[PDB]
Amino acid sequence: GSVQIVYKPVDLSKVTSKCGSLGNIHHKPGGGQVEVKSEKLDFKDRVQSKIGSLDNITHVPGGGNKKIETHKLTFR
Amino acid sequence: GSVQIVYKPVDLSKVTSKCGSLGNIHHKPGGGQVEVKSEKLDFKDRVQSKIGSLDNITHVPGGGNKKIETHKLTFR
Amino acid sequence: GSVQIVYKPVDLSKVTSKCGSLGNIHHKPGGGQVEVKSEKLDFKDRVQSKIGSLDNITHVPGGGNKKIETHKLTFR
């Protein structure tokens, strides 16, 4: 009845970027407006919410590479 | 009945950037506006919430690389 | 009835950046406005909340790389 699991990934990989220069970036969005109305809010178990927002983002990561590697075993 | 589990991920990986210069960056959003209304808010178990916000962000990380590598085993 | 669990990752991985200069960065958002109203707030177990905010952020980490690696066993 003897069961053997040997698990040996060999990951010689690479993720790479070369950029000569990251240039001139302008983020100039106009004046946004947000309006939200209720009489009641009533939240129970494990709710998560964003109920009125205005979000301006410039990321410009300079080589934002990702090597996301979520991984698992399980048994019986 | 002998069970053997041998987990050994080898990983020689590289996540890499070369950037010659990070340039000229201008985060200039106009004047935003947010308005939010209720008579009542009523939050119970483990609620998490943002009711009204204005968020301006400039990240610009130079090297922005990620090697996220979440993992588990589990048994019986 | 013998169980043997051997757990030996070999993570020789590297996360790397070269940036030749971090440039000129100008975070100049306009005058924001936020307004939030209620007649009652009522929060119970394990609530966490933000109810009116104006948040301006410049990060500029100059090689903000991440090697996040949450990792585990569990048993029986």
mmCIF file with all atom_site columns, N, CA and C in Angstrom, chain B residues 3-5 7 9 11 13 15 17 19 22-23 25 27 29 32 34 36 38-39 41 43 46-49 51 54 56 58-59 61 63 65 67 69 71 73, chain C residues 2 4 6 8 10 12 14 16 18 20-21 24 26-28 30 33 35 37 39 42 44-45 48 50 53 55-57 59-60 63 65-68 70 72:
data_model
loop_
_atom_site.group_PDB
_atom_site.id
_atom_site.type_symbol
_atom_site.label_atom_id
_atom_site.label_alt_id
_atom_site.label_comp_id
_atom_site.label_asym_id
_atom_site.label_entity_id
_atom_site.label_seq_id
_atom_site.pdbx_PDB_ins_code
_atom_site.Cartn_x
_atom_site.Cartn_y
_atom_site.Cartn_z
_atom_site.occupancy
_atom_site.B_iso_or_equiv
_atom_site.pdbx_formal_charge
_atom_site.auth_seq_id
_atom_site.auth_comp_id
_atom_site.auth_asym_id
_atom_site.auth_atom_id
_atom_site.pdbx_PDB_model_num
ATOM 1   N N  . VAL B 1 3  ? 3.598   6.093  3.579   1.00 0.00 ? 3  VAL B N  1
ATOM 2   C CA . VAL B 1 3  ? 3.423   7.243  2.680   1.00 0.00 ? 3  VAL B CA 1
ATOM 3   C C  . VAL B 1 3  ? 4.610   8.187  2.774   1.00 0.00 ? 3  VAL B C  1
ATOM 4   N N  . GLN B 1 4  ? 5.201   8.507  1.627   1.00 0.00 ? 4  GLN B N  1
ATOM 5   C CA . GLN B 1 4  ? 6.353   9.394  1.517   1.00 0.00 ? 4  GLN B CA 1
ATOM 6   C C  . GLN B 1 4  ? 6.056   10.557 0.572   1.00 0.00 ? 4  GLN B C  1
ATOM 7   N N  . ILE B 1 5  ? 6.160   11.782 1.071   1.00 0.00 ? 5  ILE B N  1
ATOM 8   C CA . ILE B 1 5  ? 6.016   13.011 0.291   1.00 0.00 ? 5  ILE B CA 1
ATOM 9   C C  . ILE B 1 5  ? 7.300   13.836 0.361   1.00 0.00 ? 5  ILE B C  1
ATOM 10  N N  . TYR B 1 7  ? 8.833   17.121 -1.252  1.00 0.00 ? 7  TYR B N  1
ATOM 11  C CA . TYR B 1 7  ? 8.592   18.365 -1.969  1.00 0.00 ? 7  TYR B CA 1
ATOM 12  C C  . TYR B 1 7  ? 9.873   19.194 -1.989  1.00 0.00 ? 7  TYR B C  1
ATOM 13  N N  . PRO B 1 9  ? 10.942  22.111 -4.795  1.00 0.00 ? 9  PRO B N  1
ATOM 14  C CA . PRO B 1 9  ? 11.072  23.030 -5.920  1.00 0.00 ? 9  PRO B CA 1
ATOM 15  C C  . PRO B 1 9  ? 12.446  23.691 -5.964  1.00 0.00 ? 9  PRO B C  1
ATOM 16  N N  . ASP B 1 11 ? 14.619  26.527 -7.866  1.00 0.00 ? 11 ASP B N  1
ATOM 17  C CA . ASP B 1 11 ? 14.273  27.762 -8.541  1.00 0.00 ? 11 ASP B CA 1
ATOM 18  C C  . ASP B 1 11 ? 15.502  28.660 -8.643  1.00 0.00 ? 11 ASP B C  1
ATOM 19  N N  . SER B 1 13 ? 15.433  31.274 -10.806 1.00 0.00 ? 13 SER B N  1
ATOM 20  C CA . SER B 1 13 ? 14.821  32.277 -11.664 1.00 0.00 ? 13 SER B CA 1
ATOM 21  C C  . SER B 1 13 ? 15.323  33.688 -11.411 1.00 0.00 ? 13 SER B C  1
ATOM 22  N N  . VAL B 1 15 ? 14.068  37.897 -12.164 1.00 0.00 ? 15 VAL B N  1
ATOM 23  C CA . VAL B 1 15 ? 13.100  38.900 -12.632 1.00 0.00 ? 15 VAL B CA 1
ATOM 24  C C  . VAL B 1 15 ? 13.822  40.233 -12.686 1.00 0.00 ? 15 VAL B C  1
ATOM 25  N N  . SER B 1 17 ? 15.013  44.223 -14.619 1.00 0.00 ? 17 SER B N  1
ATOM 26  C CA . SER B 1 17 ? 14.856  45.414 -15.461 1.00 0.00 ? 17 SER B CA 1
ATOM 27  C C  . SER B 1 17 ? 16.176  46.152 -15.642 1.00 0.00 ? 17 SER B C  1
ATOM 28  N N  . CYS B 1 19 ? 16.581  50.096 -17.039 1.00 0.00 ? 19 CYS B N  1
ATOM 29  C CA . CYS B 1 19 ? 15.965  51.308 -17.558 1.00 0.00 ? 19 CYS B CA 1
ATOM 30  C C  . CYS B 1 19 ? 17.004  52.430 -17.640 1.00 0.00 ? 19 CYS B C  1
ATOM 31  N N  . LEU B 1 22 ? 14.410  57.290 -15.922 1.00 0.00 ? 22 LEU B N  1
ATOM 32  C CA . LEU B 1 22 ? 12.982  57.238 -15.599 1.00 0.00 ? 22 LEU B CA 1
ATOM 33  C C  . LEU B 1 22 ? 12.186  58.493 -16.018 1.00 0.00 ? 22 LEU B C  1
ATOM 34  N N  . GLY B 1 23 ? 12.789  59.384 -16.808 1.00 0.00 ? 23 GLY B N  1
ATOM 35  C CA . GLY B 1 23 ? 12.077  60.408 -17.572 1.00 0.00 ? 23 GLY B CA 1
ATOM 36  C C  . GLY B 1 23 ? 11.375  61.507 -16.768 1.00 0.00 ? 23 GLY B C  1
ATOM 37  N N  . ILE B 1 25 ? 7.744   63.035 -15.487 1.00 0.00 ? 25 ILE B N  1
ATOM 38  C CA . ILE B 1 25 ? 6.397   62.525 -15.193 1.00 0.00 ? 25 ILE B CA 1
ATOM 39  C C  . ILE B 1 25 ? 5.579   63.586 -14.474 1.00 0.00 ? 25 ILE B C  1
ATOM 40  N N  . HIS B 1 27 ? 1.846   64.222 -12.896 1.00 0.00 ? 27 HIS B N  1
ATOM 41  C CA . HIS B 1 27 ? 0.519   63.848 -12.405 1.00 0.00 ? 27 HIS B CA 1
ATOM 42  C C  . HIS B 1 27 ? -0.255  65.107 -12.003 1.00 0.00 ? 27 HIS B C  1
ATOM 43  N N  . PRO B 1 29 ? -4.013  65.923 -12.233 1.00 0.00 ? 29 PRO B N  1
ATOM 44  C CA . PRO B 1 29 ? -5.470  65.847 -12.344 1.00 0.00 ? 29 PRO B CA 1
ATOM 45  C C  . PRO B 1 29 ? -6.134  67.145 -11.856 1.00 0.00 ? 29 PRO B C  1
ATOM 46  N N  . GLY B 1 32 ? -11.136 67.412 -8.346  1.00 0.00 ? 32 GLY B N  1
ATOM 47  C CA . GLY B 1 32 ? -12.240 66.466 -8.231  1.00 0.00 ? 32 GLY B CA 1
ATOM 48  C C  . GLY B 1 32 ? -13.214 66.802 -7.104  1.00 0.00 ? 32 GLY B C  1
ATOM 49  N N  . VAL B 1 34 ? -16.463 64.891 -4.571  1.00 0.00 ? 34 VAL B N  1
ATOM 50  C CA . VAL B 1 34 ? -17.257 63.741 -4.123  1.00 0.00 ? 34 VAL B CA 1
ATOM 51  C C  . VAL B 1 34 ? -18.295 64.185 -3.098  1.00 0.00 ? 34 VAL B C  1
ATOM 52  N N  . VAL B 1 36 ? -21.516 62.263 -0.683  1.00 0.00 ? 36 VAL B N  1
ATOM 53  C CA . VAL B 1 36 ? -22.214 61.021 -0.291  1.00 0.00 ? 36 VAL B CA 1
ATOM 54  C C  . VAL B 1 36 ? -23.210 61.261 0.845   1.00 0.00 ? 36 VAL B C  1
ATOM 55  N N  . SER B 1 38 ? -26.576 59.681 3.432   1.00 0.00 ? 38 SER B N  1
ATOM 56  C CA . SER B 1 38 ? -27.464 58.710 4.082   1.00 0.00 ? 38 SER B CA 1
ATOM 57  C C  . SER B 1 38 ? -28.275 59.383 5.199   1.00 0.00 ? 38 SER B C  1
ATOM 58  N N  . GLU B 1 39 ? -29.294 58.723 5.741   1.00 0.00 ? 39 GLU B N  1
ATOM 59  C CA . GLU B 1 39 ? -29.804 59.009 7.088   1.00 0.00 ? 39 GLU B CA 1
ATOM 60  C C  . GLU B 1 39 ? -29.144 58.095 8.139   1.00 0.00 ? 39 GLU B C  1
ATOM 61  N N  . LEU B 1 41 ? -26.259 54.553 8.829   1.00 0.00 ? 41 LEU B N  1
ATOM 62  C CA . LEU B 1 41 ? -25.328 53.466 8.502   1.00 0.00 ? 41 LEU B CA 1
ATOM 63  C C  . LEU B 1 41 ? -25.313 52.470 9.664   1.00 0.00 ? 41 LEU B C  1
ATOM 64  N N  . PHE B 1 43 ? -23.551 48.740 10.509  1.00 0.00 ? 43 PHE B N  1
ATOM 65  C CA . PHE B 1 43 ? -22.590 47.717 10.084  1.00 0.00 ? 43 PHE B CA 1
ATOM 66  C C  . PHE B 1 43 ? -22.350 46.699 11.206  1.00 0.00 ? 43 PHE B C  1
ATOM 67  N N  . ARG B 1 46 ? -17.585 42.051 10.758  1.00 0.00 ? 46 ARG B N  1
ATOM 68  C CA . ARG B 1 46 ? -16.459 41.966 9.806   1.00 0.00 ? 46 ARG B CA 1
ATOM 69  C C  . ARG B 1 46 ? -16.658 42.760 8.504   1.00 0.00 ? 46 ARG B C  1
ATOM 70  N N  . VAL B 1 47 ? -17.519 43.769 8.531   1.00 0.00 ? 47 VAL B N  1
ATOM 71  C CA . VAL B 1 47 ? -17.652 44.764 7.459   1.00 0.00 ? 47 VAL B CA 1
ATOM 72  C C  . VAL B 1 47 ? -16.343 45.535 7.288   1.00 0.00 ? 47 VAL B C  1
ATOM 73  N N  . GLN B 1 48 ? -15.919 45.821 6.059   1.00 0.00 ? 48 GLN B N  1
ATOM 74  C CA . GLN B 1 48 ? -14.892 46.837 5.829   1.00 0.00 ? 48 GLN B CA 1
ATOM 75  C C  . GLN B 1 48 ? -15.205 47.727 4.637   1.00 0.00 ? 48 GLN B C  1
ATOM 76  N N  . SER B 1 49 ? -15.234 49.045 4.822   1.00 0.00 ? 49 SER B N  1
ATOM 77  C CA . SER B 1 49 ? -15.798 49.936 3.805   1.00 0.00 ? 49 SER B CA 1
ATOM 78  C C  . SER B 1 49 ? -15.204 51.340 3.747   1.00 0.00 ? 49 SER B C  1
ATOM 79  N N  . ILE B 1 51 ? -16.464 55.068 2.499   1.00 0.00 ? 51 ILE B N  1
ATOM 80  C CA . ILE B 1 51 ? -17.778 55.663 2.210   1.00 0.00 ? 51 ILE B CA 1
ATOM 81  C C  . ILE B 1 51 ? -17.666 56.853 1.256   1.00 0.00 ? 51 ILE B C  1
ATOM 82  N N  . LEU B 1 54 ? -11.373 60.813 -2.220  1.00 0.00 ? 54 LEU B N  1
ATOM 83  C CA . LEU B 1 54 ? -10.677 61.323 -3.387  1.00 0.00 ? 54 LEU B CA 1
ATOM 84  C C  . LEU B 1 54 ? -9.188  60.999 -3.250  1.00 0.00 ? 54 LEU B C  1
ATOM 85  N N  . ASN B 1 56 ? -5.373  60.535 -5.056  1.00 0.00 ? 56 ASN B N  1
ATOM 86  C CA . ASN B 1 56 ? -4.432  60.846 -6.137  1.00 0.00 ? 56 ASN B CA 1
ATOM 87  C C  . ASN B 1 56 ? -3.091  60.170 -5.857  1.00 0.00 ? 56 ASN B C  1
ATOM 88  N N  . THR B 1 58 ? 0.879   58.686 -7.384  1.00 0.00 ? 58 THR B N  1
ATOM 89  C CA . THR B 1 58 ? 1.982   58.569 -8.345  1.00 0.00 ? 58 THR B CA 1
ATOM 90  C C  . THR B 1 58 ? 3.015   57.586 -7.818  1.00 0.00 ? 58 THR B C  1
ATOM 91  N N  . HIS B 1 59 ? 3.141   56.414 -8.432  1.00 0.00 ? 59 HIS B N  1
ATOM 92  C CA . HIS B 1 59 ? 3.945   55.327 -7.872  1.00 0.00 ? 59 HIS B CA 1
ATOM 93  C C  . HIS B 1 59 ? 5.416   55.424 -8.290  1.00 0.00 ? 59 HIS B C  1
ATOM 94  N N  . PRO B 1 61 ? 8.196   53.550 -9.439  1.00 0.00 ? 61 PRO B N  1
ATOM 95  C CA . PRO B 1 61 ? 9.115   52.756 -8.628  1.00 0.00 ? 61 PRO B CA 1
ATOM 96  C C  . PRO B 1 61 ? 10.542  52.508 -9.111  1.00 0.00 ? 61 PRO B C  1
ATOM 97  N N  . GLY B 1 63 ? 12.813  50.331 -10.409 1.00 0.00 ? 63 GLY B N  1
ATOM 98  C CA . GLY B 1 63 ? 12.583  48.914 -10.550 1.00 0.00 ? 63 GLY B CA 1
ATOM 99  C C  . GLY B 1 63 ? 11.317  48.494 -9.818  1.00 0.00 ? 63 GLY B C  1
ATOM 100 N N  . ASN B 1 65 ? 9.651   45.332 -10.068 1.00 0.00 ? 65 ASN B N  1
ATOM 101 C CA . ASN B 1 65 ? 9.471   43.898 -10.297 1.00 0.00 ? 65 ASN B CA 1
ATOM 102 C C  . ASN B 1 65 ? 8.802   43.181 -9.116  1.00 0.00 ? 65 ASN B C  1
ATOM 103 N N  . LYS B 1 67 ? 7.894   39.055 -7.620  1.00 0.00 ? 67 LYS B N  1
ATOM 104 C CA . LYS B 1 67 ? 8.104   37.593 -7.707  1.00 0.00 ? 67 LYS B CA 1
ATOM 105 C C  . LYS B 1 67 ? 7.220   36.869 -6.693  1.00 0.00 ? 67 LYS B C  1
ATOM 106 N N  . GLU B 1 69 ? 4.897   34.381 -4.883  1.00 0.00 ? 69 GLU B N  1
ATOM 107 C CA . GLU B 1 69 ? 5.120   32.936 -4.982  1.00 0.00 ? 69 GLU B CA 1
ATOM 108 C C  . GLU B 1 69 ? 4.376   32.172 -3.889  1.00 0.00 ? 69 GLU B C  1
ATOM 109 N N  . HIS B 1 71 ? 2.245   29.622 -1.710  1.00 0.00 ? 71 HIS B N  1
ATOM 110 C CA . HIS B 1 71 ? 2.275   28.165 -1.755  1.00 0.00 ? 71 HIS B CA 1
ATOM 111 C C  . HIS B 1 71 ? 1.656   27.484 -0.517  1.00 0.00 ? 71 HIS B C  1
ATOM 112 N N  . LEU B 1 73 ? 1.323   23.025 1.109   1.00 0.00 ? 73 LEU B N  1
ATOM 113 C CA . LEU B 1 73 ? 0.899   21.617 1.137   1.00 0.00 ? 73 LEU B CA 1
ATOM 114 C C  . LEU B 1 73 ? -0.238  21.464 2.152   1.00 0.00 ? 73 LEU B C  1
ATOM 115 N N  . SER C 1 2  ? 3.678   4.384  8.788   1.00 0.00 ? 2  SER C N  1
ATOM 116 C CA . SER C 1 2  ? 4.754   5.364  8.619   1.00 0.00 ? 2  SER C CA 1
ATOM 117 C C  . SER C 1 2  ? 4.377   6.485  7.640   1.00 0.00 ? 2  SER C C  1
ATOM 118 N N  . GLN C 1 4  ? 6.275   9.937  6.153   1.00 0.00 ? 4  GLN C N  1
ATOM 119 C CA . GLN C 1 4  ? 7.457   10.793 6.039   1.00 0.00 ? 4  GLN C CA 1
ATOM 120 C C  . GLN C 1 4  ? 7.195   11.966 5.096   1.00 0.00 ? 4  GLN C C  1
ATOM 121 N N  . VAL C 1 6  ? 9.175   15.277 3.674   1.00 0.00 ? 6  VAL C N  1
ATOM 122 C CA . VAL C 1 6  ? 10.409  16.047 3.468   1.00 0.00 ? 6  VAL C CA 1
ATOM 123 C C  . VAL C 1 6  ? 10.067  17.268 2.632   1.00 0.00 ? 6  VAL C C  1
ATOM 124 N N  . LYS C 1 8  ? 11.880  20.664 1.234   1.00 0.00 ? 8  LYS C N  1
ATOM 125 C CA . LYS C 1 8  ? 13.148  21.376 1.015   1.00 0.00 ? 8  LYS C CA 1
ATOM 126 C C  . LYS C 1 8  ? 13.240  22.150 -0.309  1.00 0.00 ? 8  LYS C C  1
ATOM 127 N N  . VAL C 1 10 ? 14.601  24.984 -2.850  1.00 0.00 ? 10 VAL C N  1
ATOM 128 C CA . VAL C 1 10 ? 15.925  25.565 -3.107  1.00 0.00 ? 10 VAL C CA 1
ATOM 129 C C  . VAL C 1 10 ? 15.726  26.810 -3.958  1.00 0.00 ? 10 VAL C C  1
ATOM 130 N N  . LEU C 1 12 ? 16.939  29.837 -5.112  1.00 0.00 ? 12 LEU C N  1
ATOM 131 C CA . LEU C 1 12 ? 18.092  30.688 -5.433  1.00 0.00 ? 12 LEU C CA 1
ATOM 132 C C  . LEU C 1 12 ? 17.699  31.857 -6.353  1.00 0.00 ? 12 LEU C C  1
ATOM 133 N N  . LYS C 1 14 ? 16.454  35.552 -7.888  1.00 0.00 ? 14 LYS C N  1
ATOM 134 C CA . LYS C 1 14 ? 16.830  36.959 -7.680  1.00 0.00 ? 14 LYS C CA 1
ATOM 135 C C  . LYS C 1 14 ? 15.873  37.932 -8.358  1.00 0.00 ? 14 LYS C C  1
ATOM 136 N N  . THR C 1 16 ? 15.801  41.946 -9.473  1.00 0.00 ? 16 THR C N  1
ATOM 137 C CA . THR C 1 16 ? 16.914  42.884 -9.728  1.00 0.00 ? 16 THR C CA 1
ATOM 138 C C  . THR C 1 16 ? 16.497  44.050 -10.614 1.00 0.00 ? 16 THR C C  1
ATOM 139 N N  . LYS C 1 18 ? 18.391  47.748 -12.582 1.00 0.00 ? 18 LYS C N  1
ATOM 140 C CA . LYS C 1 18 ? 19.269  48.910 -12.786 1.00 0.00 ? 18 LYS C CA 1
ATOM 141 C C  . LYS C 1 18 ? 18.473  50.058 -13.398 1.00 0.00 ? 18 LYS C C  1
ATOM 142 N N  . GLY C 1 20 ? 19.198  54.122 -14.557 1.00 0.00 ? 20 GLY C N  1
ATOM 143 C CA . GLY C 1 20 ? 20.333  55.033 -14.762 1.00 0.00 ? 20 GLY C CA 1
ATOM 144 C C  . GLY C 1 20 ? 20.181  56.396 -14.081 1.00 0.00 ? 20 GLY C C  1
ATOM 145 N N  . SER C 1 21 ? 18.953  56.895 -13.961 1.00 0.00 ? 21 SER C N  1
ATOM 146 C CA . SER C 1 21 ? 18.579  58.042 -13.128 1.00 0.00 ? 21 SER C CA 1
ATOM 147 C C  . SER C 1 21 ? 17.066  58.040 -12.933 1.00 0.00 ? 21 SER C C  1
ATOM 148 N N  . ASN C 1 24 ? 12.583  63.405 -13.321 1.00 0.00 ? 24 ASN C N  1
ATOM 149 C CA . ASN C 1 24 ? 11.910  64.571 -12.748 1.00 0.00 ? 24 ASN C CA 1
ATOM 150 C C  . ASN C 1 24 ? 10.418  64.256 -12.612 1.00 0.00 ? 24 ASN C C  1
ATOM 151 N N  . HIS C 1 26 ? 6.546   65.293 -10.950 1.00 0.00 ? 26 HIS C N  1
ATOM 152 C CA . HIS C 1 26 ? 5.757   66.458 -10.575 1.00 0.00 ? 26 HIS C CA 1
ATOM 153 C C  . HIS C 1 26 ? 4.316   66.059 -10.264 1.00 0.00 ? 26 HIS C C  1
ATOM 154 N N  . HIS C 1 27 ? 3.995   65.870 -8.990  1.00 0.00 ? 27 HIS C N  1
ATOM 155 C CA . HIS C 1 27 ? 2.648   65.556 -8.508  1.00 0.00 ? 27 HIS C CA 1
ATOM 156 C C  . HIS C 1 27 ? 1.913   66.845 -8.089  1.00 0.00 ? 27 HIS C C  1
ATOM 157 N N  . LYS C 1 28 ? 1.058   67.394 -8.961  1.00 0.00 ? 28 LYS C N  1
ATOM 158 C CA . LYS C 1 28 ? 0.368   68.684 -8.819  1.00 0.00 ? 28 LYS C CA 1
ATOM 159 C C  . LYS C 1 28 ? -1.156  68.564 -8.987  1.00 0.00 ? 28 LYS C C  1
ATOM 160 N N  . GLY C 1 30 ? -5.102  69.212 -8.529  1.00 0.00 ? 30 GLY C N  1
ATOM 161 C CA . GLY C 1 30 ? -5.922  70.374 -8.181  1.00 0.00 ? 30 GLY C CA 1
ATOM 162 C C  . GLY C 1 30 ? -6.610  70.237 -6.822  1.00 0.00 ? 30 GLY C C  1
ATOM 163 N N  . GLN C 1 33 ? -12.308 68.149 -3.306  1.00 0.00 ? 33 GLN C N  1
ATOM 164 C CA . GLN C 1 33 ? -13.379 68.354 -2.338  1.00 0.00 ? 33 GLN C CA 1
ATOM 165 C C  . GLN C 1 33 ? -14.118 67.047 -2.046  1.00 0.00 ? 33 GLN C C  1
ATOM 166 N N  . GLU C 1 35 ? -17.406 65.548 0.638   1.00 0.00 ? 35 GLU C N  1
ATOM 167 C CA . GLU C 1 35 ? -18.462 65.814 1.616   1.00 0.00 ? 35 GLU C CA 1
ATOM 168 C C  . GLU C 1 35 ? -19.276 64.553 1.887   1.00 0.00 ? 35 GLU C C  1
ATOM 169 N N  . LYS C 1 37 ? -22.420 62.768 4.577   1.00 0.00 ? 37 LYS C N  1
ATOM 170 C CA . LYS C 1 37 ? -23.498 63.050 5.538   1.00 0.00 ? 37 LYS C CA 1
ATOM 171 C C  . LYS C 1 37 ? -24.250 61.793 5.979   1.00 0.00 ? 37 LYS C C  1
ATOM 172 N N  . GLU C 1 39 ? -27.300 60.935 9.575   1.00 0.00 ? 39 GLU C N  1
ATOM 173 C CA . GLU C 1 39 ? -27.898 61.294 10.871  1.00 0.00 ? 39 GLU C CA 1
ATOM 174 C C  . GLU C 1 39 ? -27.526 60.294 11.989  1.00 0.00 ? 39 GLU C C  1
ATOM 175 N N  . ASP C 1 42 ? -23.736 53.363 13.257  1.00 0.00 ? 42 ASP C N  1
ATOM 176 C CA . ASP C 1 42 ? -23.862 52.312 14.264  1.00 0.00 ? 42 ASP C CA 1
ATOM 177 C C  . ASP C 1 42 ? -23.065 51.070 13.843  1.00 0.00 ? 42 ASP C C  1
ATOM 178 N N  . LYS C 1 44 ? -20.868 47.603 14.852  1.00 0.00 ? 44 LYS C N  1
ATOM 179 C CA . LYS C 1 44 ? -20.649 46.507 15.812  1.00 0.00 ? 44 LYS C CA 1
ATOM 180 C C  . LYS C 1 44 ? -19.405 45.682 15.461  1.00 0.00 ? 44 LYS C C  1
ATOM 181 N N  . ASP C 1 45 ? -19.396 44.380 15.741  1.00 0.00 ? 45 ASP C N  1
ATOM 182 C CA . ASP C 1 45 ? -18.199 43.526 15.758  1.00 0.00 ? 45 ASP C CA 1
ATOM 183 C C  . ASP C 1 45 ? -17.284 43.641 14.529  1.00 0.00 ? 45 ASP C C  1
ATOM 184 N N  . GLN C 1 48 ? -14.226 47.853 10.163  1.00 0.00 ? 48 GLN C N  1
ATOM 185 C CA . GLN C 1 48 ? -13.209 48.886 9.947   1.00 0.00 ? 48 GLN C CA 1
ATOM 186 C C  . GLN C 1 48 ? -13.542 49.746 8.733   1.00 0.00 ? 48 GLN C C  1
ATOM 187 N N  . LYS C 1 50 ? -13.429 53.909 6.562   1.00 0.00 ? 50 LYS C N  1
ATOM 188 C CA . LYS C 1 50 ? -12.973 55.276 6.264   1.00 0.00 ? 50 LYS C CA 1
ATOM 189 C C  . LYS C 1 50 ? -14.128 56.076 5.669   1.00 0.00 ? 50 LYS C C  1
ATOM 190 N N  . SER C 1 53 ? -12.299 61.114 3.115   1.00 0.00 ? 53 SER C N  1
ATOM 191 C CA . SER C 1 53 ? -10.854 61.351 3.017   1.00 0.00 ? 53 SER C CA 1
ATOM 192 C C  . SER C 1 53 ? -10.363 61.842 1.659   1.00 0.00 ? 53 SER C C  1
ATOM 193 N N  . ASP C 1 55 ? -6.611  61.921 -0.163  1.00 0.00 ? 55 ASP C N  1
ATOM 194 C CA . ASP C 1 55 ? -5.323  61.245 -0.003  1.00 0.00 ? 55 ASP C CA 1
ATOM 195 C C  . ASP C 1 55 ? -4.449  61.496 -1.241  1.00 0.00 ? 55 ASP C C  1
ATOM 196 N N  . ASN C 1 56 ? -3.351  62.237 -1.100  1.00 0.00 ? 56 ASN C N  1
ATOM 197 C CA . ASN C 1 56 ? -2.393  62.505 -2.176  1.00 0.00 ? 56 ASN C CA 1
ATOM 198 C C  . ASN C 1 56 ? -1.070  61.797 -1.867  1.00 0.00 ? 56 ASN C C  1
ATOM 199 N N  . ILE C 1 57 ? -0.558  60.954 -2.766  1.00 0.00 ? 57 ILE C N  1
ATOM 200 C CA . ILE C 1 57 ? 0.617   60.105 -2.506  1.00 0.00 ? 57 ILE C CA 1
ATOM 201 C C  . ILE C 1 57 ? 1.602   60.164 -3.677  1.00 0.00 ? 57 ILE C C  1
ATOM 202 N N  . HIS C 1 59 ? 5.118   57.967 -4.295  1.00 0.00 ? 59 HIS C N  1
ATOM 203 C CA . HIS C 1 59 ? 5.852   56.859 -3.674  1.00 0.00 ? 59 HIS C CA 1
ATOM 204 C C  . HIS C 1 59 ? 7.347   56.894 -4.028  1.00 0.00 ? 59 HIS C C  1
ATOM 205 N N  . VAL C 1 60 ? 7.672   56.857 -5.323  1.00 0.00 ? 60 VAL C N  1
ATOM 206 C CA . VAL C 1 60 ? 9.012   56.966 -5.929  1.00 0.00 ? 60 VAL C CA 1
ATOM 207 C C  . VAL C 1 60 ? 10.129  56.125 -5.261  1.00 0.00 ? 60 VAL C C  1
ATOM 208 N N  . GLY C 1 63 ? 13.779  51.519 -7.093  1.00 0.00 ? 63 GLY C N  1
ATOM 209 C CA . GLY C 1 63 ? 14.027  50.084 -6.926  1.00 0.00 ? 63 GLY C CA 1
ATOM 210 C C  . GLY C 1 63 ? 13.123  49.434 -5.879  1.00 0.00 ? 63 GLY C C  1
ATOM 211 N N  . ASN C 1 65 ? 11.288  46.702 -5.657  1.00 0.00 ? 65 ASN C N  1
ATOM 212 C CA . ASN C 1 65 ? 10.993  45.313 -5.999  1.00 0.00 ? 65 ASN C CA 1
ATOM 213 C C  . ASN C 1 65 ? 10.356  44.561 -4.814  1.00 0.00 ? 65 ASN C C  1
ATOM 214 N N  . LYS C 1 66 ? 9.579   43.501 -5.072  1.00 0.00 ? 66 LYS C N  1
ATOM 215 C CA . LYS C 1 66 ? 8.943   42.625 -4.061  1.00 0.00 ? 66 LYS C CA 1
ATOM 216 C C  . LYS C 1 66 ? 9.201   41.141 -4.323  1.00 0.00 ? 66 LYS C C  1
ATOM 217 N N  . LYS C 1 67 ? 9.508   40.347 -3.294  1.00 0.00 ? 67 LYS C N  1
ATOM 218 C CA . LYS C 1 67 ? 9.666   38.877 -3.375  1.00 0.00 ? 67 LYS C CA 1
ATOM 219 C C  . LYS C 1 67 ? 8.736   38.160 -2.382  1.00 0.00 ? 67 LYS C C  1
ATOM 220 N N  . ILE C 1 68 ? 7.454   38.521 -2.381  1.00 0.00 ? 68 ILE C N  1
ATOM 221 C CA . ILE C 1 68 ? 6.445   38.009 -1.436  1.00 0.00 ? 68 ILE C CA 1
ATOM 222 C C  . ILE C 1 68 ? 6.268   36.497 -1.613  1.00 0.00 ? 68 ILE C C  1
ATOM 223 N N  . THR C 1 70 ? 4.523   33.810 0.739   1.00 0.00 ? 70 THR C N  1
ATOM 224 C CA . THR C 1 70 ? 3.776   33.095 1.788   1.00 0.00 ? 70 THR C CA 1
ATOM 225 C C  . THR C 1 70 ? 3.719   31.604 1.452   1.00 0.00 ? 70 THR C C  1
ATOM 226 N N  . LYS C 1 72 ? 3.599   27.238 3.230   1.00 0.00 ? 72 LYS C N  1
ATOM 227 C CA . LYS C 1 72 ? 3.245   26.418 4.406   1.00 0.00 ? 72 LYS C CA 1
ATOM 228 C C  . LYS C 1 72 ? 3.102   24.916 4.188   1.00 0.00 ? 72 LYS C C  1
#
